[PDB]
Amino acid sequence: GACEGTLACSTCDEENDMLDLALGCQ
Amino acid sequence: SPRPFNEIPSPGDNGWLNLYHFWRETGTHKVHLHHVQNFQKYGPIYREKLGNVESVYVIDPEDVALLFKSEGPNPERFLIPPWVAYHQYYQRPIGVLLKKSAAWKKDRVALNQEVMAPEATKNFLPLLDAVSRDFVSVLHRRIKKAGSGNYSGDISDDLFRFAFESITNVIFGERQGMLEEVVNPEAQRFIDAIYQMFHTSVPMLNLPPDLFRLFRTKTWKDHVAAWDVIFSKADIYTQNFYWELRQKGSVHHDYRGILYRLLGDSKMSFEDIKANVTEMLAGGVDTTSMTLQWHLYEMARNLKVQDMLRAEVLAARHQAQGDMATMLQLVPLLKASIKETLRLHPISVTLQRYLVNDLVLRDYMIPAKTLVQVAIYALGREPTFFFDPENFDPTRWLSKDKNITYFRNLGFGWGVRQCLGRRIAELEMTIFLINMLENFRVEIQHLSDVGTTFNLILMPEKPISFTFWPFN
Ligand code: HEM
Ligand SMILES: CC(C)CCC[C@](C)(O)[C@H]1CC[C@H]2[C@@H]3CC=C4C[C@@H](O)CC[C@]4(C)[C@H]3CC[C@@]21C
Ligand code: FES
Numbered sequence: 001g002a003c004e005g006t007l008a009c010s011t012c013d014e015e016n017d018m019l020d021l022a023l024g025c026q
Numbered sequence: 027s028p029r030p031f032n033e034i035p036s037p038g039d040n041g042w043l044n045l046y047h048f049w050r051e052t053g054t055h056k057v058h059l060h061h062v063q064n065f066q067k068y069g070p071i072y073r074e075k076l077g078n079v080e081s082v083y084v085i086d087p088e089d090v091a092l093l094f095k096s097e098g099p100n101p102e103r104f105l106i107p108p109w110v111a112y113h114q115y116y117q118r119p120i121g122v123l124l125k126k127s128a129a130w131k132k133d134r135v136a137l138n139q140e141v142m143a144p145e146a147t148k149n150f151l152p153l154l155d156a157v158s159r160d161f162v163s164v165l166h167r168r169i170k171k172a173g174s175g176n177y178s179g180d181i182s183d184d185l186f187r188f189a190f191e192s193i194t195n196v197i198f199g200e201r202q203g204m205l206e207e208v209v210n211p212e213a214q215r216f217i218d219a220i221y222q223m224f225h226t227s228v229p230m231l232n233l234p235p236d237l238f239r240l241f242r243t244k245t246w247k248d249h250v251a252a253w254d255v256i257f258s259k260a261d262i263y264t265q266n267f268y269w270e271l272r273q274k275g276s277v278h279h280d281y282r283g284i285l286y287r288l289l290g291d292s293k294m295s296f297e298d299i300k301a302n303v304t305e306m307l308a309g310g311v312d313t314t315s316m317t318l319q320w321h322l323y324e325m326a327r328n329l330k331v332q333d334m335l336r337a338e339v340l341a342a343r344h345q346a347q348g349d350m351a352t353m354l355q356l357v358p359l360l361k362a363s364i365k366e367t368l369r370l371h372p373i374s375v376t377l378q379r380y381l382v383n384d385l386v387l388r389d390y391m392i393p394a395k396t397l398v399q400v401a402i403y404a405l406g407r408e409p410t411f412f413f414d415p416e417n418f419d420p421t422r423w424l425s426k427d428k429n430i431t432y433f434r435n436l437g438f439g440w441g442v443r444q445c446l447g448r449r450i451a452e453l454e455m456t457i458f459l460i461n462m463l464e465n466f467r468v469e470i471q472h473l474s475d476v477g478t479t480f481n482l483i484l485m486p487e488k489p490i491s492f493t494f495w496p497f498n
Binding site: 002003004005006007008009010011013014017020021 | 094099134135138139142143144354355358361428431432433435440441442444448449452
């Protein structure tokens with residue numbers, strides 16, 4: 001968990017866009 | 027095995043000669059067109075030393091993917107040398123933008139809790155909606171005054187004031203009154219200094235600081251004065267808020283803004299908080315405003331898309347029974363239209379990362395510590411990565427064909443060091459556009475193609491004068 005559970009990366013609509021550029025915390 | 031670094035195509039090894047040819051052929055203010063031309067000359071990957079800095083430039087989403095996959099826990103992008111020099115020489119406390127490694131991570135984590143996390147950002151909605159609703163009232167007022175049943179004007183200054191009201195409202199939980207008829211002249215001076223800071227950055231860009239003062243003395247002096255305004259006013263806002271918080275008490279069940287939260291409960295020192303407030307304020311005025319101006323421009327340029335977006339918003343407001351939070355879940359074409367605006371009109375000409383390990387791209391070995399830049403502007407106009415790239419098509423981002431959007435949504439960057447203001451920006455723009463679409467039809471009289479100029483951030487090359495009709 002790089003950003004530490006804030007939806008600001010993808011190491012683990014808004015989640016949908018993080019999902020493209022590849023969760024755990026959500 | 028891969029070819030060595032020196033085999034990557036380039037104009038040559040003389041940074042100063044390359045800089046000379048760049049200035050003479052293209053110009054400092056057309057760096058985006060320089061990249062486009064370079065990929066046409068060299069193919070999908072090249073390297074270019076400008077002054078003392080060499081970068082490898084890349085355009086292919088597939089290479090972008092490898093770059094961001096090889097990213098370490100504390101990414102570094104390119105630091106703007108006049109900004110670094112200003113903070114160092116005038117001993118100005120730095121925020122997340124200018125920090126690295128552990129010190130960067132510490133601020134970023136504390137800030138993500140308050141500006142990126144859904145638990146925090148859900149509180150932004152009414153604060154941002156209030157400002158957008160006021161912007162609509164401004165235009166209705168100008169329509170009545172015109173007496174013509176419409177209003178025509180360049181509203182760039184108003185967009186800057188809108189972006190300022192928005193960012194200050196979520197940070198301070200207080201209205202600065204920049205959408206009023208009579209404006210605070212000192213707040214206006216703050217807005218102007220932000221633009222001046224960007225504008226004066228350009229003549230110093232590809233030079234070491236030792237050459238700034240020698241060859242760009244006037245520009246450096248103007249740049250110093252711009253940052254001084256930024257800092258002196260951001261300091262005052264933060265300091266006044268700190269003391270008013272003690273005068274009134276810190277017992278509040280309602281949401282009071284980002285600063286309240288940081289001062290009330292975070293791992294950040296006051297010093298780090300104040301430095302980051304300054305950076306959030308300055309990073310949020312020219313960005314969302316120019317982006318929204320481009321969005322309005324694309325809607326006027328494609329009236330069919332404008333109709334589709336309005337119909338989507340009207341249906342969303344109805345189904346949500348007026349609730350903004352619920353609406354924002356029913357407006358996927360509008361959200362896609364923001365991605366589409368940023369593809370054509372990125373604020374940032376490139377994204378950059380310094381490599382932490384050696385990396386192969388296009389069968390070339392790129393050594394550790396090499397600066398790699400993704401030419402995001404060039405990528406957005408490139409017909410091999412986007413179908414009919416000159417056409418404004420939001421549905422593009424809705425394809426089930428996941429190949430069509432693979433590493434294409436790059437306007438806010440990627441990963442842990444992506445735009446800190448991304449959620450604020452998305453929310454601010456989406457809410458703004460909902461309010462605008464519900465209230466006005468947007469057109470441009472004597473429409474012509476508006477190009478782009480590089481003023482550190484990318485911007486329209488010339489003014490855009492809109493015509494607004496009240497929508498019934
Ligand atoms: C349309 C609006 C905006 C666009 C297009 C935009 C774009 C960007 C981009 C491309 C980056 C670099 C990302 C990377 O290196 O991967 C960035 C960084 C940054 N942005 Fe924005 N931005 C916008 C709005 C805002 C707002 C409203 C704020 C205020 C909170 C803000 C504050 C920042 C900060 C502080 C950084 C540096 C973050 C760090 O180094 O950790 N931006 N932005
Ligand atoms: C004023 C500050 C506190 C905040 C500025 C926020 C910006 C506008 O969000 C900054 C953050 C990083 C900046 C980029 C950093 C590096 C480069 C590479 C350079 O060659 C062109 C400018 C460009 C592409 C910058 C454009 C403006 C950016 C993208
Ligand atoms: S940990 Fe960064 S997105 Fe879940």
